Structure formats: C-alpha cells, structure tokens
C-alpha cells in the first residue's frame, strides 16, 4: 500500500500522508496547493 490520491473530491491527499480537506483549507493554502499541483503536473 502506498498513499495515492484521495477517493473523494473535497479532499487533497499528498503522498506524505497528510490528507487535507478543501473545506478546511484556508484560501492561502488553497492557492499554494494549486500552484504546487501545477508544478508537479509541469514536471
């Protein structure tokens, strides 16, 4: 078993293990996680 992505859609699950919920993330971390996902797509 390895930590993939979330089986929901209001959730963000990093491969670290730290599952974050989109309703609980503030807008700063929403923008930051969106840019980080853009980096991991762009590579």
């Amino acid at each position: 078993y390895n930590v993939g992505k979330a089986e929901k859609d209001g959730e963000i699950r990093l491969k670290n293990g730290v599952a974050m919920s989109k309703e609980e993330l503030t807008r700063e971390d929403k923008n930051r996680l969106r840019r980080a996902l853009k980096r991991k797509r762009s590579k």
Binding site: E11, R13, N16, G17, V18, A19, M20, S21, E23
Partner: protein
C-alpha cells in the same frame, strides 16, 4: 403549469429530463394531476396507487437547512481547536471528516497526554473513541493507515490503533466490511517501524558503554 410534463408507464411516472419517480411493479394506465395549481398526482398501476405530494419546494428548505447546519458546526470546531477540550472536537471533526484537523486534535491531545502523568489519552476522549460506530471507525482506520506510512506521523496512528483495539470488540472489528484490506496494508509498516525503533534502542547503549568507561576512568 407551463412547460415540463409528466409521462407514464416505463414502469413509472417521469417528469421533464429529471426525477424518475418510484413507479410500480408493472404497467400503468394513469395520470390525474388536475387539482388546484398542480396538486396531488394520482398515478396508478394495475392495482397499486400513489398520491404524489405537492409543489416540490419542500426538498429545497431541507436542502438549504443542511448547509446552514454544516457551516454552524464548522464554527464550533475552530473554537474547540482554539480553547482545547479535545473530545467533542474529535467527534465533530469525525462528523465533518476534516483530516488534518483530526490529526491535530489527536496529536495535541497525545502531546498533553505525554505531559500529564490502561488509558492513553484523557479518559473522556478514549471513551468518545470507544463509542463510535462502524463507518466512523473504518474511516478513522483508513486515515490511520495513511498516517502510518510516515516515520514521523506514525506514533499518533499507532496509539489510535491501540485504543481502537483495546476499546472495541475484536470480532466486531473483523466483521466490519473493509477492515481486512486496511489491516493488511498497515501491518508491514508497523513491522518496519518496530525494526527501526528496535535498532534505535539497540544502538542506544553507547550511553551505557560510555558510562562504564567513565567509571573505569577512576
């Protein structure tokens, strides 16, 4: 009432498309919708009837009442994260399914449990984790599974697994459908963490060797 319309006998009345209704067991020659504006809709099979309710505005009030509930008891979890009292914070973050806040309530309750002084959290928190049902404990072990894959966040996961194991019934935990693909996933992580902490405590005895050299010094 202007433009959407009811049709019959797929096995069911269907409105215009959306909202396949309950229907019947067999076929149908029936629609009477013609009370006041568009009130009670009688729809009849060979024998069985339905008297369909009213203007469909009842659901929206119920639909608009949940969002208000969820945004109310989202601003109780932030107050609990502020002022402590981690038990209702725990069960309410379990109800909202907020995972990193769940990790925060378990981690800071565990840290203060290490601070002060059979029981591994405060006793009201581990009875609150004792009284939770199958869906909540299976999602709790889904995310104990994915917390256990770290070497940092593994201790919180191991102690939550420990209190589940010593506060629930083991046959119940086996019979919950889904909890044999989780425990197979995070037995070998516990095995490698056991080997790592055992290696760490076996290389911990250079302190004892340094003490016996420092005693042979004089």
């Amino acid at each position: 009432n202007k433009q959407k319309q009811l049709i019959s006998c797929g096995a069911d009345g269907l409105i215009k498309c959306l909202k396949t209704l309950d229907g019947h067991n067999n076929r149908l020659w029936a629609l009477s919708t013609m009370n006041d504006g568009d009130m009670i809709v009688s729809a009849d099979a060979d024998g069985v009837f339905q008297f369909w309710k009213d203007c469909t505005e009842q659901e929206i009030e119920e639909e608009q009442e949940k969002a208000k509930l969820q945004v109310e008891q989202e601003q109780s979890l932030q107050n609990y994260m502020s002022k402590g009292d981690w038990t209702n914070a725990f069960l309410l973050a379990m109800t909202l399914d907020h995972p990193m806040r769940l990790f925060n309530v378990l981690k800071r309750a565990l840290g203060e449990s290490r601070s002060r002084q059979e029981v591994i959290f405060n006793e009201e928190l581990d009875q609150a984790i004792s009284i939770l049902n199958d869906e909540q404990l299976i999602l709790l072990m889904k995310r104990c599974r994915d917390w256990n894959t770290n070497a940092k966040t593994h201790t919180i996961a191991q102690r939550t697994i420990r209190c589940i194991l010593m506060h629930h019934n083991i046959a119940k935990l086996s019979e919950i459908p889904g909890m044999v693909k989780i425990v197979d996933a995070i037995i070998p992580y516990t095995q490698r963490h056991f080997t790592r902490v055992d290696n760490l405590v076996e290389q911990s005895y250079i302190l004892d060797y340094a003490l016996v050299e420092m005693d042979k010094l004089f």
